[PDB]
Amino acid sequence: HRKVLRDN
Amino acid sequence: WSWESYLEEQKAITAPVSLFQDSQAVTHNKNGFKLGMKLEGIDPQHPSMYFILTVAEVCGYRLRLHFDGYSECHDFWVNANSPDIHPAGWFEKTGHKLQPPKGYFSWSQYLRSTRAQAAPKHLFVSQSHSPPPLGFQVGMKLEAVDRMNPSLVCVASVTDVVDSRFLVHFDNWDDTYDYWCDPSSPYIHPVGWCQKQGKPLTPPQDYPDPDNFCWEKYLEETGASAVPTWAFKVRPPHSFLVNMKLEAVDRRNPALIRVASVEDVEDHRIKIHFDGWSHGYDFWIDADHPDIHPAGWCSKTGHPLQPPL
Ligand SMILES: [Cl-]
Structure with a gap:
């Protein structure tokens, strides 16, 4: 279960 | 309203002119x-x-x-x-x-x-027309704090060089995170700094298999060199003390400059308070920000100064 840096 | 009367009344001191960058202090141009x-x-x-x-x-x-x-x-x-x-x-x-x-x-x-x-x-x-920052060339790589998300130290590039300054870009992100700085910026470090420090390095956006990002491989595959380690200079912490007074542009109405106080301090940042206003309006600013000035700057340059609320 991956956590991803999102900027939108 | 005058600074003299206000400092007498508040038993306060202004931040000495010597504390500021020349560019923040200069009134005679x-x-x-x-x-x-x-x-x-x-x-x-x-x-x-x-x-x-x-x-x-x-x-x-x-x-x-x-x-x-x-x-x-x-x-x-x-x-x-x-x-x-x-x-x-x-x-x-x-x-x-x-x-x-x-x-x-x-x-x-x-x-x-x-x-x-x-x-x-x-x-x-x-x-x-002036000598650029030695050791910083367009295309070179470094590690940089994302000043908008300052828990992150990231893979970065020099993408522009103009006089004494260069532009730091976050590889694979848009330019909204970019910033201009000089070799003594406390927000930049050489390739390998995070590894030396035992700190995580944030690799480029969408880098394949990001947990295995390696600088050595990234530099090879991008035909890039690291900014040499000697080029990075240590900026001394500033010498602003809590309660020192000065002038500062208001961020809510940038046309206005206000009587201000140093509310809190870090090594390279200053928490600004507008005298008379809610502490809700207090904000952190880098000590080199072009929008802070010694007491007297408005009066000497011919700009209105908002006295305390
Ligand atoms: Cl428009």
Whole structure:
């Protein structure tokens, strides 16, 4: 279960 | 209202002029910018991009710039010694891209169409005529704090060099995170710094198999070199003390400059409080920010000063 840096 | 009476009444001191960068303190230069002069400048919302700008207003040593062709809602204020503006023609002489006016390139043709005057060259502190920062070349790589998400230290590149400053870009992100700095910025470090420090390095956006990112491989695959370690200089912490007073541009109405206090301090940052206002309005600012000034700056430069609320 991956956590991803999102900027939108 | 006067500073003297106010300091007497509050039993307070102003931050000595010596505490500031020369550029923040200087009051003896006149503002030579005039209404309608045209020039080139960085978009503060996109610091890698250059636009044609027109002088919309002048107040003391400050000026309000308008993006030709775009809405006046994007107008912004700079000081007359800003290094983020350049004379007409600077882009082509120096290898920079100039965005044209909205919808619209040749300056001679545009000046003929508009019957406007370009701001004269002598007004500009930055014309790419001074010795660049040694060791910082376009294309080189480093590690940089994302100043907007400062828990992150990230893979970064130098993408522009202008006089004493260079532009730091976050690989694979947009330019909204970019910032201009110099070799002593506390926000930059050599390739390998995070590894030395036992700190996680944030790799480029969408880098395949990011947990296995390796600088050695990244540099090889990008044909890039690291900024040499000797090029990074240690900036001393500033010497502002809590309760010291000064002047500061209001971020909520940038036209205004207010009587201010040092509320709190870090090594390189200062928490500003507007005397008389709610602490809700307090904000952190880097000590080198062009929008803080010693007491007396407004009065000496011919800009109104808002006294405490
Ligand atoms: Cl617009």
